[PDB]
């Protein structure tokens, strides 16, 4: 078929699912961020989930 | 002389191996090769082990 | 019992505010030590000056809207968070901005002081929609360390603040993003050694290599008590 | 408990009691070759 | 020895014939790494013999799969043993328990 | 019985403790199952297969 | 080899200059040598090393049989002194007497005297079967080995490799949880609990 | 730039092998940084003294038995791998061990030198099960760091070794477990200050303050290349 054979399998999948999946009152909810670099800064510093 | 040099595995033999390996693909194959993606080519990285 | 000092091989200048330094060889498991120490120090201890408070006339909270502008005052607070500033002498400079007419007010339109300079004057704060639309604000710049958010700021302050004191997230540290990795390196035979690749991107007010040297300075001055 | 079983007693979590112990695990081969090689009067097995 | 076992470990390690179980109960007289000498108790002793059991151990013998087979003594000097007691461990046994 | 034994040994009864990353020093977000399992070395050795 | 087969063709096969055909250790295999055994064909003189191995086996078998004889003699003499102490009150007169004079003395015929007599006959047949088994073992290890037809001698070397784990080795638990070691991580890199014990 | 600095305030030697070292005071956010850096450095790169070679008299290889000893020779080499010793004077010393008679052979029976301290004299080595059975060996103790196996040592052995000299794997590092914590410090004018209690478990062959001194020296010498040139 035309479909890609390079599909991520189960660990990449578990990691990106845990990455993208939301929660209702985790930590640092409702902030307004300048961008993805500030989101990465918040997560690596520990001020947001 | 080259055969006994490789038989004793000099550091220049490992350096020449590092030069030979670079940009020389090898084919990795796993049986049973049911479809054509059971043989693929890769650029080898010299590892220990 | 002597160690393998790293000999620097690369400082790739991607942009004027971007760098990929590379450090090989290190001893096995030292790339993660040095990379995590430098990333932690740069993220949560490197001091600087940034926007901490702004007081716009007529507005009482961050979700109310002042007219005359096409983007919200949430966008204005975002653009004022993204502003990069450097104060030389003091730790408390109140910046006052006044603008009117058709045209987006940029960072060059601020009533600047002598001890305060802007590294990006083309940074647009907000766009104006009317000729008679006037905007007046009181940007406050403090000096702190790392990142202090508005949630922790409003947990700390408790008095009834005057009307217009909108809390903006205080991002004091000049590093915008630091991300390292550990690769494989080799001296003649052994391959257990590693190669530290630090990718750094900052705003103005500092260079990336200057910020890495400042973080190494901070860690060495933290360690210098118990050194043989 | 014997003086060699007091050295390390394995804490059993089993509930049902062992009525019949586990037999000799190699009784099949040894019993078959013993029947082949032994001498028998009338119940003839093996060489006789 | 496994921390979570079943109880069949001792049965396999004795019934496999790879250990060196005691034939008669008594006290242990001499332990080398290759020889265990046991002075038999008098009630288990035949009246015509000397009452001494010798247990020579196999040390570093190649198995069929090119592994190691060696027996190590698990008893100490002067300890008493009974009939059916493990004196030497096997390749992958430990105190008479199977340990893989 | 397993949880009563874990409560005797002053261990978490759910069998999951907090683990920290050895490299970053940070804590793993969810509690991780830690315990002792009996692992065997099989006779398929890469010295014999290479 | 064809590198020198043409050189043995056009210049001349010398009918000399013998071939190296030595038993080598295989490649990538370390390990010490723990036992050598030489089986020569019955009829020829063996070698100096094979003769040395044979003298080692001779003195080893003699030491083993004499040690087991001394151990059985000590057991039998302790049973003799126990049964004679149970019979009569003879304690010091048997300690200062040598152990050879332990089977001939005593008192009149009782059950302990019949036991002493049958244990003396046990000692006699014990040393008789000792010297018989020693001569049988001696002739058994001095006689030659009837090997295959066409075989002069066989030398059996025994290596001993100690194998550590490495990436590539299959490891498994008892529930069908198999798999291959992928990396041997440092203990500072392994995850650890609140007490610092890494997994 | 108004940071404070930590000092070694106290050391709680719980046992000969266990210790807790407190650093005080630490700024807000530096406890985890210094704790993880010191944990990785103290776990990977501490120097120490480990048994390298053993030469038992009358023993050709490790897969043999000696008449009289209860242990095998390979188990004896494993017990000598577990031996803890410090050497104050030199970088390589050879210890002689002689024993006879029935009884356990421990590290206390090793004929000590002036600069060699055996920090566990009750560490058993082998046993002896006869009145006329004696043991005699010569234990070479070197100093290094990390884990050096015998195969890599042979590939680094350009010299020539006789038959009968047994090689032991060398686990040189004297640190066995490190736990750290970031507790809040009690400072009369500051509230964002911390204390770092590092709970160090050794084999008794390294001082805690000397180990932390050498770990911070290693970290500063590694950071020199960052602080100098970009």
PDB file of C-alpha atoms in Angstrom, chain E:
ATOM      1  CA  UNK E   1      18.415 -19.203  45.943  1.00  0.00           C
ATOM      2  CA  UNK E   2      15.240 -17.594  44.574  1.00  0.00           C
ATOM      3  CA  UNK E   3      13.378 -15.285  46.918  1.00  0.00           C
ATOM      4  CA  UNK E   4      10.048 -16.316  45.390  1.00  0.00           C
ATOM      5  CA  UNK E   5      10.115 -20.056  44.795  1.00  0.00           C
ATOM      6  CA  UNK E   6       7.657 -22.917  45.016  1.00  0.00           C
ATOM      7  CA  UNK E   7       8.942 -25.742  47.219  1.00  0.00           C
ATOM      8  CA  UNK E   8       9.869 -28.079  44.361  1.00  0.00           C
ATOM      9  CA  UNK E   9      13.399 -26.594  44.432  1.00  0.00           C
ATOM     10  CA  UNK E  10      14.728 -28.987  47.072  1.00  0.00           C
ATOM     11  CA  UNK E  11      12.963 -31.915  45.394  1.00  0.00           C
ATOM     12  CA  UNK E  12      14.600 -31.186  42.032  1.00  0.00           C
ATOM     13  CA  UNK E  13      18.016 -30.487  43.562  1.00  0.00           C
ATOM     14  CA  UNK E  14      18.029 -33.793  45.458  1.00  0.00           C
ATOM     15  CA  UNK E  15      16.249 -36.027  42.918  1.00  0.00           C
ATOM     16  CA  UNK E  16      18.371 -34.791  40.007  1.00  0.00           C
ATOM     17  CA  UNK E  17      21.399 -36.622  41.396  1.00  0.00           C
ATOM     18  CA  UNK E  18      23.616 -33.583  40.829  1.00  0.00           C
ATOM     19  CA  UNK E  19      24.228 -32.877  44.534  1.00  0.00           C
ATOM     20  CA  UNK E  20      25.942 -35.188  47.051  1.00  0.00           C
ATOM     21  CA  UNK E  21      23.385 -36.343  49.605  1.00  0.00           C
ATOM     22  CA  UNK E  22      24.370 -38.272  52.709  1.00  0.00           C
ATOM     23  CA  UNK E  23      23.817 -42.016  52.643  1.00  0.00           C
ATOM     24  CA  UNK E  24      23.862 -42.416  56.435  1.00  0.00           C
ATOM     25  CA  UNK E  25      23.518 -40.021  59.344  1.00  0.00           C
ATOM     26  CA  UNK E  26      26.448 -39.004  61.490  1.00  0.00           C
ATOM     27  CA  UNK E  27      28.968 -36.292  62.264  1.00  0.00           C
ATOM     28  CA  UNK E  28      31.321 -34.734  59.728  1.00  0.00           C
ATOM     29  CA  UNK E  29      35.005 -35.488  60.280  1.00  0.00           C
ATOM     30  CA  UNK E  30      36.891 -33.683  57.491  1.00  0.00           C
ATOM     31  CA  UNK E  31      35.854 -31.176  54.814  1.00  0.00           C
ATOM     32  CA  UNK E  32      38.138 -30.374  51.929  1.00  0.00           C
ATOM     33  CA  UNK E  33      37.016 -28.737  48.706  1.00  0.00           C
ATOM     34  CA  UNK E  34      37.114 -32.192  47.094  1.00  0.00           C
ATOM     35  CA  UNK E  35      36.408 -34.709  49.881  1.00  0.00           C
ATOM     36  CA  UNK E  36      33.919 -34.951  52.753  1.00  0.00           C
ATOM     37  CA  UNK E  37      34.455 -37.625  55.411  1.00  0.00           C
ATOM     38  CA  UNK E  38      31.547 -38.475  57.714  1.00  0.00           C
ATOM     39  CA  UNK E  39      31.769 -40.627  60.823  1.00  0.00           C
ATOM     40  CA  UNK E  40      28.470 -42.513  60.912  1.00  0.00           C
ATOM     41  CA  UNK E  41      26.354 -42.618  64.058  1.00  0.00           C
ATOM     42  CA  UNK E  42      26.314 -45.979  65.803  1.00  0.00           C
ATOM     43  CA  UNK E  43      22.610 -46.740  65.337  1.00  0.00           C
ATOM     44  CA  UNK E  44      22.935 -46.435  61.541  1.00  0.00           C
ATOM     45  CA  UNK E  45      26.180 -48.434  61.429  1.00  0.00           C
ATOM     46  CA  UNK E  46      26.503 -52.004  60.229  1.00  0.00           C
ATOM     47  CA  UNK E  47      28.437 -54.121  62.772  1.00  0.00           C
ATOM     48  CA  UNK E  48      31.056 -55.291  60.265  1.00  0.00           C
ATOM     49  CA  UNK E  49      32.204 -52.027  58.690  1.00  0.00           C
ATOM     50  CA  UNK E  50      34.275 -49.104  59.963  1.00  0.00           C
ATOM     51  CA  UNK E  51      31.446 -46.557  59.966  1.00  0.00           C
ATOM     52  CA  UNK E  52      33.188 -44.047  57.686  1.00  0.00           C
ATOM     53  CA  UNK E  53      31.663 -42.590  54.512  1.00  0.00           C
ATOM     54  CA  UNK E  54      33.830 -40.899  51.875  1.00  0.00           C
ATOM     55  CA  UNK E  55      32.255 -38.391  49.481  1.00  0.00           C
ATOM     56  CA  UNK E  56      34.613 -37.500  46.654  1.00  0.00           C
ATOM     57  CA  UNK E  57      33.380 -34.458  44.755  1.00  0.00           C
ATOM     58  CA  UNK E  58      33.615 -33.677  41.054  1.00  0.00           C
ATOM     59  CA  UNK E  59      35.574 -30.488  40.352  1.00  0.00           C
ATOM     60  CA  UNK E  60      35.438 -28.609  37.022  1.00  0.00           C
ATOM     61  CA  UNK E  61      34.132 -31.272  34.671  1.00  0.00           C
ATOM     62  CA  UNK E  62      32.870 -30.274  31.232  1.00  0.00           C
ATOM     63  CA  UNK E  63      29.187 -31.038  30.734  1.00  0.00           C
ATOM     64  CA  UNK E  64      27.531 -31.993  27.451  1.00  0.00           C
ATOM     65  CA  UNK E  65      26.743 -28.361  26.604  1.00  0.00           C
ATOM     66  CA  UNK E  66      30.315 -27.197  27.435  1.00  0.00           C
ATOM     67  CA  UNK E  67      29.296 -25.733  30.781  1.00  0.00           C
ATOM     68  CA  UNK E  68      30.921 -26.214  34.185  1.00  0.00           C
ATOM     69  CA  UNK E  69      30.118 -28.965  36.679  1.00  0.00           C
ATOM     70  CA  UNK E  70      31.747 -28.636  40.073  1.00  0.00           C
ATOM     71  CA  UNK E  71      30.581 -29.594  43.546  1.00  0.00           C
ATOM     72  CA  UNK E  72      31.264 -27.349  46.513  1.00  0.00           C
ATOM     73  CA  UNK E  73      30.865 -28.497  50.135  1.00  0.00           C
ATOM     74  CA  UNK E  74      28.001 -26.826  51.973  1.00  0.00           C
ATOM     75  CA  UNK E  75      28.602 -28.365  55.409  1.00  0.00           C
ATOM     76  CA  UNK E  76      31.221 -27.238  57.913  1.00  0.00           C
ATOM     77  CA  UNK E  77      33.628 -29.111  60.154  1.00  0.00           C
ATOM     78  CA  UNK E  78      32.051 -30.951  63.071  1.00  0.00           C
ATOM     79  CA  UNK E  79      28.424 -30.415  62.067  1.00  0.00           C
ATOM     80  CA  UNK E  80      25.962 -33.321  62.335  1.00  0.00           C
ATOM     81  CA  UNK E  81      24.108 -34.647  59.303  1.00  0.00           C
ATOM     82  CA  UNK E  82      21.182 -37.047  58.986  1.00  0.00           C
ATOM     83  CA  UNK E  83      20.266 -39.597  56.339  1.00  0.00           C
ATOM     84  CA  UNK E  84      19.309 -37.649  53.240  1.00  0.00           C
ATOM     85  CA  UNK E  85      21.215 -34.435  53.969  1.00  0.00           C
ATOM     86  CA  UNK E  86      22.865 -32.397  51.235  1.00  0.00           C
ATOM     87  CA  UNK E  87      26.621 -32.243  51.843  1.00  0.00           C
ATOM     88  CA  UNK E  88      27.868 -30.783  48.558  1.00  0.00           C
ATOM     89  CA  UNK E  89      26.023 -28.430  46.249  1.00  0.00           C
ATOM     90  CA  UNK E  90      25.686 -28.984  42.534  1.00  0.00           C
ATOM     91  CA  UNK E  91      26.366 -26.708  39.574  1.00  0.00           C
ATOM     92  CA  UNK E  92      23.238 -24.597  39.995  1.00  0.00           C
ATOM     93  CA  UNK E  93      22.086 -25.625  43.453  1.00  0.00           C
ATOM     94  CA  UNK E  94      22.477 -23.758  46.733  1.00  0.00           C
ATOM     95  CA  UNK E  95      22.102 -25.421  50.174  1.00  0.00           C
ATOM     96  CA  UNK E  96      20.226 -28.240  48.465  1.00  0.00           C
ATOM     97  CA  UNK E  97      17.823 -25.827  46.748  1.00  0.00           C
ATOM     98  CA  UNK E  98      17.665 -25.393  42.984  1.00  0.00           C
ATOM     99  CA  UNK E  99      19.129 -22.034  41.948  1.00  0.00           C
ATOM    100  CA  UNK E 100      19.097 -21.269  38.219  1.00  0.00           C
TER     101      UNK E 100
END
